[PDB]
Amino acid sequence: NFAELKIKRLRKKFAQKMLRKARRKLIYEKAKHYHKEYRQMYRTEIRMARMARKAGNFYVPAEPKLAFVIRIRGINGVSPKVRKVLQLLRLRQIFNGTFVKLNKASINMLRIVEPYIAWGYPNLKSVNELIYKRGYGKINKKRIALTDNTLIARSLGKYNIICMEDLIHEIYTVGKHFKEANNFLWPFKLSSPRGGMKKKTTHFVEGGDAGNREDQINRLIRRMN
Amino acid sequence: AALRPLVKPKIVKKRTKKFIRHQSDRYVKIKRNWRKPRGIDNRVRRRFKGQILMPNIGYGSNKKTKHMLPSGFRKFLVHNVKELEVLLMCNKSYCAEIAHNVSSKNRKAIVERAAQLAIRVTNPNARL
Amino acid sequence: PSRLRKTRKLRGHVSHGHGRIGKHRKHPGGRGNAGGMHHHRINFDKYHPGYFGKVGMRHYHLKRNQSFCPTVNLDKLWTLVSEQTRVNAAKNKTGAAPIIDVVRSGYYKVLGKGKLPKQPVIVKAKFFSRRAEEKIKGVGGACVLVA
Amino acid sequence: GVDIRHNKDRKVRRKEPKSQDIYLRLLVKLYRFLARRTNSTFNQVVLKRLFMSRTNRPPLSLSRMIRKMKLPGRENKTAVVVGTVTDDVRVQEVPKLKVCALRVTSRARSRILKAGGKILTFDQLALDSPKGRGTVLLSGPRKGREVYRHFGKAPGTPHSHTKPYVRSKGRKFERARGRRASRGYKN
Amino acid sequence: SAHLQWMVVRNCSSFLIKRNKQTYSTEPNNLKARNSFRYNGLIHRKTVGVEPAADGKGVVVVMKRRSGQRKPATSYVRTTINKNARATLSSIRHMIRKNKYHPDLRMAAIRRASAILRSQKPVM
Amino acid sequence: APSRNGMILKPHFHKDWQRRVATWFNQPARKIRRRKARQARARRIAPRPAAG
Amino acid sequence: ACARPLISVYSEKGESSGKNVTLPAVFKAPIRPDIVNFVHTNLRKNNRQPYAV
RNA sequence: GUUCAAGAGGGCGUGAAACCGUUAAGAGGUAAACGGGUGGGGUCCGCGCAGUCCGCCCGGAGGAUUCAACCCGGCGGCGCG
RNA sequence: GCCACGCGUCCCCCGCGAGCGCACGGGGUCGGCGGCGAUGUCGGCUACCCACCCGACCCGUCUUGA
RNA sequence: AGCGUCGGGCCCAUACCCGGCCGUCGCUGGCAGUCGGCAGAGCGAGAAAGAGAGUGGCGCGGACGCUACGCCGCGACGAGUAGGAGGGCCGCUGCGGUGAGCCUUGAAGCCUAGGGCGCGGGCCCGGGUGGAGCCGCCGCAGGUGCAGAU
Ligand SMILES: [Mg+2]
Ligand SMILES: [Mg+2]
Ligand SMILES: [Mg+2]
Ligand SMILES: [Mg+2]
Ligand SMILES: [Mg+2]
Ligand SMILES: [Mg+2]
Ligand SMILES: [Mg+2]
Ligand SMILES: [Mg+2]
Ligand SMILES: [Mg+2]
Ligand SMILES: [Mg+2]
Ligand SMILES: [Mg+2]
Ligand SMILES: [Mg+2]
Ligand SMILES: [Mg+2]
Ligand SMILES: [Mg+2]
Ligand SMILES: [Mg+2]
Ligand SMILES: [Mg+2]
Ligand SMILES: [Mg+2]
Ligand SMILES: [Mg+2]
Ligand SMILES: [Mg+2]
Ligand SMILES: [Mg+2]
Ligand SMILES: [Mg+2]
Ligand SMILES: [Mg+2]
Ligand SMILES: [Mg+2]
């Protein structure tokens, strides 16, 4: 016949077209709602301050959920108790990066390797730059580039994670499904730092780069990316 | 009208200079033909700076232009007329090249037939 | 095929696969089965326990032919005869079992290993064990001896 | 530079068979095709086994095949072997079967056919049941070789029921110093 | 059978000719002449061959009749076509297509015919 | 010098054995010279039984 | 294979006679070069005389 | 002067390297010799030294006893005849 | 300023419209050009010699170490 | 152009980043679908599965392709002595088949500032010398590859 089949095949494509559109509009609405979210989150932390000073007290803000680690020195001649930790954090190459949710368990390991890393509390823009520019997923054991949302829906559809934005949301808000969101991400291959380094060997406080430099990590990222 | 090939790409070649053997310059008994030294105290084996190079696989050439002559053709070694009809269908990429011991009077026929088939010949004016 | 052997690839390499601190010298440890008691004591005690020592009674002029005594299990007693003998027996309503001379086929003893199928047999053998005999009786038939 | 060992990255399992015989390779071509173009894992197992050596595809006795079909629920169901089907003398009664195997000896062939059975080849099997439904897979005993007795924790070593290699048993060939309690010791 | 005797031949044939990292075959009814189960001539039931004529001039197309495969004398059937180029390719195209006869070899055979005609035509 | 495992064994190659080797390339010819002598004997004692 | 065809006999002078003979069964037997090759290369070694210094 | 040839002339077929003579070329105070990277000059080669044809189309100019469809004859392929 | 727009029916309160162009879009194309040339000029990596800049201790071996 | 405390700027490693290329490993990945007047050319897509049977209400046309011990696509890696394994259209001398193989219109060997191939082992063409035998492909066997050893 190839008449009824043609008309049927057209209805099938038309259905799948409307479906793809609907997923698009859904995506849009999640993103705008998150913009409203972030704006609110930022203002309130000030409002608490102004009102606290008015009363005369001090507002202590919350401890930071998240830290952005970087391995600064190389592969030659390193204690085996270190090596184990380092390879548990997936820092196999130099100038590699990783996200790490915080707690006593993680922080004691980062203490044990203080001299080899540089960590701190990263900002939202630094999270955007890193994910968008150099996002590469671990799909079927293969380093494949994060260029379309399909590549995410196939793997993470079960957590309602359909796009870069939801991913960002989980990372900044260390939500439920951090383990899966981060283990999905391949260790970040960052380049050598433009401008230079002050002194690789020593701690920040004694004028070096190692160890906790809370916020200045952003300055360092902008110089390395 | 030289015989064009189907494609005449860039024949880049990573290295042109030959791999001479360490100390062929000094002695005669030592030939140019490469031989990897398997000594303990050797330098060349262990890459000292400003020394004879060692052949890695890395020099390997692009697949598309291996055994490719500048014109673009490949060789095929021929002894006689029967072997040209083979090439008659793979005419534009490959070319016959006649063997040394083959005579002159037969060469004449080889070129005459091949000129009918339009097959390019590298050595058509070889004896006279 | 020497072309397949290892020495062809080894041409070039100096010590020809025997190492160059401890070279392939002639008899580095000593010869044969030497130092069995002393400095190869182990190999013997880890892999050949018993090598040393005497045991038993010396028997001088041994003749293997006297003690020739090949055994056969009941597991494969019926194997000796063609199939229609077994078939015709179930046909026999009279219940006359066929006689199997084992000696004819070059087996002497009858051991009692396997399970025997339900149909009587007369077995003319030379020796019998205790369990093979009683197995037959429960089935049926007798154990006719012969020297 | 990265700190990974590259020790065990190469895998040794077989890809293709060492044999040059044509019929085995034609089986291979076929089951490669059905392997990739189907979902059934059955075909992958059959593939693996087609590459394996003589020891690894051992002979299946008839007694073992029979009672494995006597098991309940697998009535009227084709038995599948990669090795050879040898005959058993120590088994009188022979229920009628449906066998598949690369080789079967004449004796077992006669035993089955007079009973009213059936011997399939693989090209017939592919047509009958391509996915292979209604199939009892089987194998012979890999450890059946006499050699495995020789392996393990060494002799002359507490608890090691392990055959030693010996030219000839007798009174005075490895019975004395390490076995009798009298002479020296035993373990 | 065919696949069987393909696996037999592929390597150990006298007609096969290996050199200079190349591999060819000089059988009569091969076109493209490359050692391969598709183009091998002798194997199949239905086999094509496009030669130039016995006399220098002309082209004979050859076909294999499927009846007597163990009797070579009666198997092949030659037939010269001494016309112009275009009508040659029309008649050949029709011979092969409309009979469902080995349509794999369609374009190859065409190309060879044109090159043959080229040859018996005067040289440049 | 025994490494890990083997049949302990006593080969008899200490005597000058490479001297006294009997090679059997004779065989086919020997078979014929027997066969010929047998046919010639039976031809001699014509009607008597061949075997004896 | 199961199928056995009929072969025509030819006269010594080339023409076909009336008689037609059935194919024996061996000709449908399995081909196995690995064996042929192996066998040939062992049997041919026996026809070999000794050489020695 | 023989011989096709003494470019085989009685330790005489072919006649390599080490070594020497001469000729030709180039160069020259940190012994010579080397790798990489370039330049200059020689050397011969390219049988270079006004530069691609191929289908198809459009158009203008020639010519051959020529196209399709049917009839006859033969053959092959296929047949849910 | 809004990725808000049949009618009827459902809830809280008052499965086929076709058509045409643009492009920061699943890895470069021009539907753009110019000079030289038949007896002294063009190309010729390698291979022949020379020059310059940088690099550079003679091989094999035993050896903790050449 | 010294000593102590410091700023900006600036210099390069076979390290790091982006890109090109070789080989290997892994995905035990993909490909027999070249199904053509018996035709209708798809099965990469966020979501366990069918372009499924039925039954009531003019012009004759369509490139390449696949030696499946092949072809093709994806990622990641590459120092190596003593030592082990794989592939060698690397090479030597001889034997059974095979090329209607070559050759006095000049074989082998040898010489070469010629043209070329291969990562390399080595090999092919031109020229000169020489005057009678030689090589390619599939298999087999070995007294089978030199710088050294007073
Ligand atoms: Mg800078
Ligand atoms: Mg030294
Ligand atoms: Mg080594
Ligand atoms: Mg030594
Ligand atoms: Mg030794
Ligand atoms: Mg030792
Ligand atoms: Mg590396
Ligand atoms: Mg051992
Ligand atoms: Mg006699
Ligand atoms: Mg002399
Ligand atoms: Mg001379
Ligand atoms: Mg020389
Ligand atoms: Mg001079
Ligand atoms: Mg020494
Ligand atoms: Mg040392
Ligand atoms: Mg010392
Ligand atoms: Mg560098
Ligand atoms: Mg890269
Ligand atoms: Mg290593
Ligand atoms: Mg390596
Ligand atoms: Mg001469
Ligand atoms: Mg001569
Ligand atoms: Mg020498």
Cα(F6)–Cα(B110) distance, integer angstroms: 69
φ and ψ at A160, to 5 degrees? 55, 40
Which of helix, strand or coil describes residue D157? Answer: coil
Q: For the beta carbon of residue E30, count every other beta carbon within 10 angstroms.
A: 21
Half-sphere exposure of residue F50: CA atoms within 13 angstroms, side-chain side = 7
Q: Is chain C touching chain D, with at least 3 CB–CB pairs below 8 Å?
A: yes
Give the residue ranges of DSSP H helices in D2-131. 22-37, 42-50, 62-70, 106-115, 122-128
Cα(G11)–Cα(G18) distance, integer angstroms: 9
Sort out which chain F residues have CB atoms less than 8 A from D160's CB and list them: none
Instruction: Read off the tokens for C110.
Output: 């009858």
Query: Which residue is nearest nucleotide J47, judged by alpha carbon to C1' distance?
Result: A157
Which pairs from C128-135 meet CB under 8 Å and 24+ separation? C132/C74, C135/C74
Cα(C43)–Cα(C34) distance, integer angstroms: 11
Give the residue from chain A lying closest to D5, CA to CA: A92
Which pairs from D28-35 meet CB under 8 Å and 24+ separation? D30/D122, D30/D123, D30/D126, D34/D126, D34/D130
Instruction: Give B45's DSSP letter.
Output: G
Q: Round to a whole number and report the distance in Å from the CA of D6 to the C1' of J121.
A: 29
Do the Cβ atoms of B59 and B91 come closer than 8 Å? no
Give, for E25, the enclosing helix (H) or strand (E): strand E22-25
Cα(D96)–Cα(D117) distance, integer angstroms: 5
φ and ψ at D85, to 5 degrees? -95, 100
Cα(D130)–Cα(D123) distance, integer angstroms: 10
- Nearest CA distance, F7 vs chain C (angstrom): 9
Complete DSSP assignment for C4-54:
GSTHHHHTTSTTTTS-SSS---S-TT-STTTTTTTTTHHHHHHH-TT-S--
Which of helix, strand or coil describes residue D145? Answer: coil
Do the Cβ atoms of D145 and D55 come closer than 8 Å? yes
Cβ neighbors of A220 (< 8 A, separation 6 or more) are A70, A118, A193, A209, A213
Cα(C33)–Cα(C11) distance, integer angstroms: 33
Do the Cβ atoms of A120 and A68 come closer than 8 Å? yes
Cα(D44)–Cα(A52) distance, integer angstroms: 71
Which pairs from C92-97 meet CB under 8 Å and 24+ separation? C95/C120, C97/C121, C97/C122, C97/C140, C97/C141
Cα(D91)–Cα(D51) distance, integer angstroms: 32
Do the Cβ atoms of E48 and E109 come closer than 8 Å? yes
Cα(A183)–Cα(A179) distance, integer angstroms: 6
Q: Round to a whole number and report the distance in Å from the CA of A2 to the C1' of J54.
A: 18
Q: Is chain A touching chain G, with at least 3 CB–CB pairs below 8 Å?
A: no
Q: Is the CB of B39 under 7 A from strand I?
A: yes
Give residues whose Cβ lies within 5 Å of ion ligand 6. C 22, 28
Cα(A178)–Cα(A173) distance, integer angstroms: 9
How large is the C-alpha radius of gyration of chain A? 22
Cα(D179)–Cα(C49) distance, integer angstroms: 7
Does the CB of B91 have a partner CB in chain E at under 8 Å?
A: yes
Instruction: Read off the tokens for B81.
Output: 């007329």
Cβ neighbors of F24 (< 8 A, separation 6 or more) are none
Sort out which chain C residues have CB atoms less than 8 A from F8's CB and list them: 33, 48, 51
Sort out which chain A residues have CB atoms less than 8 A from D1's CB and list them: 74-75, 93
- CB nearest to F1's CB, from C28, C47, C48: C28
C109-110/C71-72 β-pairing:
parallel
Do the Cβ atoms of C139 and C100 come closer than 8 Å? no
Give, for F16, the enclosing helix (H) or strand (E): none
Which pairs from C99-105 meet CB under 8 Å and 24+ separation? C99/C123, C99/C124, C99/C144, C100/C124, C102/C72, C102/C77, C102/C126, C103/C146, C105/C80
Cα(C134)–Cα(A96) distance, integer angstroms: 83
φ and ψ at E17, to 5 degrees? -145, 105
Do the Cβ atoms of C114 and C74 come closer than 8 Å? yes
In the D/G pair of chains, how many CB contacts fall below 8 A?
8
Do the Cβ atoms of D80 and D139 come closer than 8 Å? no
Give, for F43, the enclosing helix (H) or strand (E): helix F27-44
Which of helix, strand or coil describes residue C109? Answer: strand
AA letter at E22: Q
Which of helix, strand or coil describes residue C145? Answer: strand
Do the Cβ atoms of D154 and C44 come closer than 8 Å? no
Give the residue ranges of DSSP H helices in B1-127. 84-87, 104-117
Complete DSSP assignment for E112-123:
HHHHHHHHHSPP
Give, for D55, the enclosing helix (H) or strand (E): none
Cα(C31)–Cα(B4) distance, integer angstroms: 75
In the C/D pair of chains, how many CB contacts fall below 8 A?
57
Angle subtended by helix axes D22-37 and E2-9, to nearest 10: 110
Do the Cβ atoms of A17 and A23 come closer than 8 Å? no
Q: How far is CA A4 from the centre of its chain?
A: 51
Q: In which residue are the tokens 């050692």 written?
A: E35
**Which ligand has the minimum distance to the alpha carbon of residue C20?**
4
Q: Which nucleotides of J are covered by protein (CB under 7 A)?
A: 9-11, 14-18, 21-23, 25-32, 34-37, 40, 45-47, 51-52, 60-69, 74-78, 81-91, 97-108, 116-122, 124-127, 133, 136-145, 147-148
Give the residue from chain G lying closest to D19, CA to CA: G34
In the B/C pair of chains, how many CB contacts fall below 8 A?
3
- CB nearest to E112's CB, from B76, B89, B115: B89
Cα(A133)–Cα(A145) distance, integer angstroms: 10
Q: Round to a whole number and report the distance in Å from the CA of E115 to the C1' of H55.
A: 14
Task: Please give the biggest Cα pair distance in chain B.
Answer: 63
Where on the phi/psi map is residue C17: left (φ > 0), alpha (ψ -120 to 50), or beta? left
- Nearest in space to A62 (alpha carbons), one of A105, A121, A108, A112: A121
Does the CB of D22 have a partner CB in chain E at under 8 Å?
A: yes
Residue numbers in A 10-29, CB below 7 Å of strand I: 10-11, 14-15, 18, 24-25, 28
- Nearest in space to D77 (alpha carbons), one of D62, D95, D99, D59: D99
String of b and e for A74-104 (b: at least 16 CB within 10 Å)? Answer: eeeeeeeeeeebbeebbbeebbbbbbbeeee
Neighbours of chain E (3+ CB pairs under 8 A): B, D, G
Closest nt by CA–C1' to A192: J16
C-alpha D173 to ligand 8 mean position (Å): 21
Complete DSSP assignment for C65-105:
TTT---EE-GGGSGGGS-HHHHHHHHH-SS--PPB--SGGG
Q: Round to a whole number and report the distance in Å from the CA of B5 to the C1' of H57.
A: 27
Q: With an 8 Å Cβ cutoff, are D178 and C55 in contact? A: no
How far, CA to CA in Å, does F10 sit from each of C42, D175, F32?
A: 19, 19, 40
- Nearest CA distance, G35 vs chain D (angstrom): 9
How far, CA to CA in Å, does D8 sit from each of A91, A111, A141, D142?
A: 21, 33, 17, 26
Cβ neighbors of G35 (< 8 A, separation 6 or more) are none
Instruction: Give C64's DSSP letter.
Output: T
Instruction: Give C3's DSSP letter.
Output: G
How far, CA to CA in Å, does A186 sit from each of A75, A98, A99, A152, A190?
A: 19, 9, 11, 14, 12
Do the Cβ atoms of F35 and C75 come closer than 8 Å? no
How far, CA to CA in Å, does A158 sit from each of A186, C4, E68, E77, F49?
A: 20, 58, 66, 68, 102
Cα(E111)–Cα(E105) distance, integer angstroms: 10
**Which ligand has the minimum distance to the alpha carbon of residue C9?**
3
Q: With an 8 Å Cβ cutoff, are A74 and D4 in contact? A: no
How far, CA to CA in Å, does G8 sit from each of D132, G3, G11?
A: 45, 16, 10
How far, CA to CA in Å, does C54 sit from each of C58, C62, C141?
A: 10, 19, 49
- Nearest CA distance, E11 vs chain D (angstrom): 12
Instruction: Read off the tokens for D5.
Output: 């060992």
Cα(D112)–Cα(D97) distance, integer angstroms: 7
Sort out which chain D residues have CB atoms less than 8 A from E8's CB and list them: 22
How far, CA to CA in Å, does F15 sit from each of A177, C34, F12, F18?
A: 83, 19, 7, 9
AA letter at D54: R
- Nearest in space to C86 (alpha carbons), one of C112, C133, C119: C119
* Residue D79 bridge partners (DSSP): D99, D136
Q: With an 8 Å Cβ cutoff, are E32 and B116 in contact? A: no
Q: For the beta carbon of residue B114, count every other beta carbon within 10 angstroms.
A: 21
Q: With an 8 Å Cβ cutoff, are D2 and A75 in contact? A: yes
Which D residues in the span 19-48 are in contact with G, Cβ-Cβ below 8 Å?
A: 19-23
Q: Which of E1, E7, E8 to mutate to test the interface with D (most CBs of D within 10 A)?
A: E7
Q: How far is CA C142 from the centre of its chain?
A: 30
Cα(A132)–Cα(A164) distance, integer angstroms: 8
Q: Which nucleotides of H are covered by protein (CB under 7 A)?
A: 17-18, 33-37, 47, 52-53, 68, 75-78
Neighbours of chain G (3+ CB pairs under 8 A): D, E
Sign of CA dihedral D140, D146, D150, D153: positive
* Residue C145 bridge partners (DSSP): C125
Instruction: Read off the tokens for A8.
Output: 């049927």
- Nearest CA distance, D140 vs chain A (angstrom): 37
Cα(A213)–Cα(A120) distance, integer angstroms: 6
φ and ψ at C28, to 5 degrees? -60, -35
Do the Cβ atoms of C102 and C125 come closer than 8 Å? yes
Q: Is chain D touching chain B, with at least 3 CB–CB pairs below 8 Å?
A: no
Give the residue from chain B lying closest to E29, CA to CA: B86
- Nearest in space to B116 (alpha carbons), one of E59, E118, E51, E113: E118
Cα(B79)–Cα(B107) distance, integer angstroms: 10
Q: Is the CB of B10 under 7 A from strand J?
A: no
Give the residue ranges of DSSP H helices in chain B. 84-87, 104-117
Which of helix, strand or coil describes residue C117? Answer: coil
Does the CB of F18 have a partner CB in chain D at under 8 Å?
A: no
Q: What is the 3-state secondary structure (H, E, C) of chain A?
A: CCCHHHHHHHHHHHHHHHHHHHHHHHHHHHHHHHHHHHHHHHHHHHHHHHHHHHHCCCCCCCCCCEEEEEECCCCCCCCHHHHHHHHHCCCCCCCEEEEEECCHHHHHHHHHCHHHEEECCCCHHHHHHHHHHHCEEEECCEEEECCCCHHHHHHHHHHCCCCHHHHHHHHHCCCCCHHHHHHHECCEECCCCCCCCCCCCCECCCCCCEEECCCCHHHHHHHHC
Do the Cβ atoms of B93 and B5 come closer than 8 Å? yes
- Nearest in space to F7 (alpha carbons), one of E31, D78, D163: D163
Is residue E4 classed exposed, middle or buried when 0-12, 13-18 and 19+ CB atoms within 10 A define those classes?
middle
Instruction: Read off the tokens for F36.
Output: 């010929």
Query: Which residue is nearest nucleotide I66, judged by alpha carbon to C1' distance?
Result: B41
Do the Cβ atoms of G22 and G4 come closer than 8 Å? yes
Does the CB of G30 have a partner CB in chain E at under 8 Å?
A: no
Complete DSSP assignment for E60-112:
EEEEE-SS-TT-GGGTEEEEE--S-HHHHHHHHHHHHHTTT--GGGHHHHHHH
Q: What angle do CA A139, A142, A145 make, to 5 degrees?
A: 75
AA letter at B45: R
Which of helix, strand or coil describes residue E24? Answer: strand
Instruction: Read off the tokens for C137.
Output: 């009786």
